Structure formats: C-alpha cells, structure tokens
Structure 1
Amino acid sequence: SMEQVAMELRLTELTRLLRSVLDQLQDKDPARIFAQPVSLKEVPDYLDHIKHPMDFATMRKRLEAQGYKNLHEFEEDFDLIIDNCMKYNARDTVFYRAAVRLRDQGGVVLRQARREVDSIG
C-alpha cells in the first residue's frame, strides 16, 4: 500500500536522524570506553551484575536494522550504557567518570533531537 511506503519513509528518515544523533553521542566518548560490549572473557561475572548490557556497537546494529521505532526506544538504550556503567563501577573510577561526562554532554544532543523529531513529525 502507499501508506506502508510512507511509513517506511518516515522510519528511514528517523533512522537517518538517529544515526546522526548516535554519531554525536559517540564523539563524546573519545576514550571509546562504551564502543564495544563489556568482554565476558575479561569480566566473567558481568552478567551477574548487569542484566541488560548495552554499548554503542550493539546500538548501531539495531539502528541499521531500523529497530528503533521512536526516539524513546533509542534513549532507553543510551541510558542503559550510562546506568550500567555507574552501577558496576565505583565513583572513583575512570569508567564511572566517563559515563557521567557522556551523560552530561549527551543531554544537549538529545534535547535538540527531541525537538527535531517532534518538529519533523
């Protein structure tokens, strides 16, 4: 149907916008602490602590499969990256501090993205 196509154009465009948002958020992680899944080889007990792991590479996989239906779903995963890190790692670690900085700097990007998603529809 024509409607299904129109919908898919919208989703494709959302994906385009979220790909840009994702790139802007990952720039705020120059150390690449959040680039890849936490290694279950190097942190064998990780899943005992963190029930829903997340990382930028995993987000990008879902993104390119057009698996984010709205901005809220995307934000949920970004929040997982931060929140997981701030629980597993103590306050006085480079890991925890990197998550705080990513959260704070990412807020700007996500504030504008919300306006844009609403604006474009």
Structure 2
Amino acid sequence: SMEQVAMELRLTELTRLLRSVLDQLQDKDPARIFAQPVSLKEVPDYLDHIKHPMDFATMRKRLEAQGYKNLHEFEEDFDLIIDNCMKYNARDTVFYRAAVRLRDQGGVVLRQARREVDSIG
C-alpha cells in the first residue's frame, strides 16, 4: 500500500535523525567507556548486577535495523547506559564520573531532538 510506504519513509527519516543524535551523544564519550558491551569474560558476574545491559554499539545495531519507533525508546536505551554504570560503579571511579558527564552533556542534545521530532512530526 501507499500508506505503508509513507510510514516506511517517516521511520527512515526518524532513523536518519536518531543516527545523527547517536553520533552527537557518542562524541560526549571520548574515552569510549560506553562504546561496547561490558565484557562477560572480564566481568563474569555482571548480569547478577545489571539485568538490562546497554551500550552504544548495541544501540547502533538496533538503530540500523530501524528498531527505534520513537525518540522515547531511543532515550530509554541511552538512559540504561548511564544508569547501569552509576549503579555498578562507585561514585569515586573514572567510570561513574564518565556517566555523569555523558548525562549532563547529552541532555542538551536530547532537549533539541525532542523539539525536532515534535516539529518534523
């Protein structure tokens, strides 16, 4: 149908916008602390602590499968990255501090993307 195509074009554009948003969020992690999943070889007990792991590579895979339907779902995953880290690592750690900085710096980027997604529909 012609509607299903029109939808598919919107999803594609949302995917295009969320791709730029992801690139901007990931620039705020220059140390690449959140680039890849926490290693289960190197942190064997991780899943006893964190029930829903997340990282930028895993968000990228979902993004390119057009698996984000709206900005809310995308933000849930970003928030997992941050909130997982702040629980698993203690306050006086390079890792916790990196998440606080990503949260603060990403907020600005997420603030504008919400307006762009409301604006462009």
Same fold per superposition (TM over 0.5): yes
- Kindly tell me the number of residue pairs found equivalent between the two proteins: 121
Identical pairs, percent: 100
Q: 1:6-54 CA deviation, whole Å, 9 max, x = no partner?
A: 0000000000000000000000000000000000010000000000000
Structure 1 residue 118 displacement after superposition: 0.3
Q: Write the distance in 1 (CA, Å) between the matches of 2:47 and 2:64.
A: 26
Structure 1 residue 59: Cα displacement: 0.1
Once the two structures are TM-superposed, the CA of residue 77 in structure 1 deviates from its matched residue by 0.1
- TM-score by length of structure 1 reads 1.00
Deviation, structure 1 residue 117: 0.2
Deviation per CA, 1:37-79, whole angstroms, max 9, x where unpaired? 0000100000000000000000000000000000000000000
Q: What is the CA–CA distance in structure 2 between the aligned matches of 1:30 and 1:41, rounded to whole Å?
A: 24
| CA deviation after TM superposition for structure 1 residue 81, in Å | 0.1
CA deviation vs aligned residue, 1:70-114 (integer Å, no higher than 9, x gap): 000000000000000000000000000000000000000000000
Structure 2: runs of 5+ lacking an equivalent? none
2:53 paired residue number: 53
Residue 5 (structure 2) pairs with residue 5 (structure 1): yes
Aligned to 2:33, what secondary structure does the other structure show? Answer: coil
CA positional deviation for 1:116: 0.1
Stretches of 4+ moved more than 2 A in 1?
A: none
Match of 1:41, SS?
A: coil
Alpha-carbon distance between aligned partners in 1 of 2:112 and 2:2, rounded to the nearest angstrom: 31
3-state DSSP of counterpart to 1:53: coil
Give the unaligned 5+ runs of structure 1: none
